[PDB]
Design a protein that fits this description.
The complex is a heteropentamer of chains A (199), B (268), C (100), D (240) and E (9). Chain B is 24% helix and 38% strand. With 268 residues, chain B is of the alpha+beta class. Chain B has 2 domains: 180 residues, 2-Layer Sandwich (Murine Class I Major Histocompatibility Complex, H2-DB, Chain A, domain 1); 84 residues, Immunoglobulin-like (Sandwich), CATH 2.60.40.10. Chain C is elongated, with a radius of gyration of 14 Å. Chain C is mainly β. In chain C, strands 1, 2, 5, 6 and 7 form a 5-stranded antiparallel beta sheet that branches. A 4-stranded antiparallel beta sheet of chain C has the order 4-3-8-9, with no helix packed on it. In chain C, 31% of the residues are buried. The N and C termini of chain C lie far apart (33 Å). Classes of the chains: A mainly beta (199), B alpha+beta (268), C mainly beta (100), D mainly beta (240), E little secondary structure (9). At the A-D interface, strand 3, strand 4, strand 10, strand 11 and strand 13 of A face strand 5, strand 9, strand 10, strand 12 and helix 1 of D. The PDB classes it as immune system.
Amino acid sequence: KTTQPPSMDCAEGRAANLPCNHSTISGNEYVYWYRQIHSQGPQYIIHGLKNNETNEMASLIITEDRKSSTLILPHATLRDTAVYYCIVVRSSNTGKLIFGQGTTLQVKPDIQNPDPAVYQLRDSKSSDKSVCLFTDFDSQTNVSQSKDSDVYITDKCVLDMRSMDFKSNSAVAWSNKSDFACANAFNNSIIPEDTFFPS
Amino acid sequence: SHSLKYFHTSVSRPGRGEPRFISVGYVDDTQFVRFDNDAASPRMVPRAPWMEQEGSEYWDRETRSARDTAQIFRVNLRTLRGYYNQSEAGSHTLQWMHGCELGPDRRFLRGYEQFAYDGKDYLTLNEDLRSWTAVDTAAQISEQKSNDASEAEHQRAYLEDTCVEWLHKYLEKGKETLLHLEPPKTHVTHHPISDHEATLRCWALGFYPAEITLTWQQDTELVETRPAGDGTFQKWAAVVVPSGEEQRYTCHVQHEGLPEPVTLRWKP
Amino acid sequence: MIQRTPKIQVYSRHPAENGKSNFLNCYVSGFHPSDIEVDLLKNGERIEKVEHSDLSFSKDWSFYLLYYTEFTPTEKDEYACRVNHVTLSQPKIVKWDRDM
Amino acid sequence: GVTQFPSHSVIEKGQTVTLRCDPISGHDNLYWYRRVMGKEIKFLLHFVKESKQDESGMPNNRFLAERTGGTYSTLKVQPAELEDSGVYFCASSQDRDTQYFGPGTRLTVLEDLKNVFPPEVAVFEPSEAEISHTQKATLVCLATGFYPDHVELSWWVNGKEVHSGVCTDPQPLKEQPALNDSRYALSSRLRVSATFWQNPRNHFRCQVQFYGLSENDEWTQDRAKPVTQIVSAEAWGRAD
Amino acid sequence: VMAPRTLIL
């Protein structure tokens, strides 16, 4: 039951339209939407039967045929990045929820000030040090994992300096092996031309 | 017009464990299903010949629904005790009746739903199907709980769609007999009470549906309509008559299965 | 508690014919609560194989049941219904009258 | 909101854990759900008041749940097996149509507790090049060598927690993915303005709350008992 | 079919 696209990219500030199909649906089955942010408790958003509905979190659009649904998030933010589950529940005395795969919604931030660069950062203590920081690239850039087993590269995560009206992407690489420079650290990703490399 | 009605009864059995629970289903005046948690097979089962063909799919859903209802009614019985302040020792009853009716046009006409505690009216779904009304003062907490949780929505969904949908399915499956009108076989009997008085009795036998009017043309006894056992009904009317002239009294039988209303006479 | 005493009717399915197979019915109705003992008697003895309909109720919430068994009427044989209920101070026996 | 205890739990194969849930008081219905690592969230049980209304998701006999006075619920795994590792979510409802979830209990059943390790935490100071190029200073925190992955990372400036400018990986990385029970690493970024970093009066601490063994568990090994603990690394602001 | 949901009174 119920199909959703496994992933969805979305720009912040604009509206997000998440589709859901349930063509087997019968007249006493209700369309619910929950979401889960990271690994914290799933969160009720909205539910409906046949006509559209709106609350302060979201809106729901159900077709006249009832065979499909749309969750509309009015003005998407980074907080709205979550897995979104569309669950059909037949009238029952338990109302048990069957969580499908859901849509993994990534709200991509703006990136007004691209300034892609790879910096070296040293430990506050001794010896180790050697961490490479790939920062300030647009949400076009994809940071791949390393082919080398002994080089660690993180996924890209987003930085929200709220009081600055500033957001930025970053990925961290480290390895502690000998011949590991910040110049070759991200060789497995397509990094933009003119990515700043400090001497 | 056609109707799909269910009657659910829960009866607490403090001595035992779980309360006795029985659900019966009716298309018009014809029973077609039952659940009884005390029966050898405690599952929803066919009660008319035209329901034998339905597969594991349908009976499983209906057993889950019946057992779930039973399990909620058990909770309710406990809670209802707490609303009235009654002992744990006594046995009490929760009843629930729901039904939908189609008009001549065979589309939704009306839906109803109500609860009774100890045979007394407890809580009724409103005619607009959008809210519940307490009929007992003790039902005010349940009235507000039901209205706050938007329970009426689920029941409206049931009475206007699911009930209607299935009623049509049942009416097709029971084609041969459900739409069949069986006229009554009628006669009049004589029984002298004395030398001055005697009884005249107008019989209506083997008819379907149960709806029937028997009038006499004030000492008029009229029994409650009764089942024959083969899905047909029986009913008699009786009038007390001075011994001698009984021909001034005539019986009048109005019933659906008859071409025209019928007059009975008594042939001595 | 609402306590209503059962109304009782004893009768046949089909017009009584001595020697032809028939069904003997005991219809109990208009009663509350649901608990009730019903028996069909032949010459004063409880008939063994007796079946009943599924417990149901009317608009006024009062319950009704039908009790039935296969029988073959005779001139000399007598049949009755025997009903016990909380509202009764003794079991109420009602004989079958082929004119009712 | 719905409450759950404990938030984390690591126990040996064979041991007992009681998981507790405190529903929004007044809610007739309480639900237990779980996610077995690798699968979707799945129904376990539904209580209407103190009664079990639906039990269809209950794994087997090793799982037992009660709700004595129709208030808080308790879910007991005895004995615990590896496949029971995952997150267990409690939920409560008034209408059965809207379910409110607690934060969940994260459960890890391990075959041998010798494998548990506290994190080591390092703070990496901002690049001189980033300061001159962007007028901003990014500190990276690195929490390495922890098992299992029960960590919470937060940043602390001048004895107060900070939220703005922070980015912590959703998932940790396996250090030795080719080995069983591989330890993990997790990174975090705090980005401040250059002149805020260049003030020597400013103190920056990366804090990692590790969830490990309690004081009840046996420890016969050489190394310090890998108990639930906070490990930190810090750095002071720098004009140069 | 019978009503798939009842009231928790």
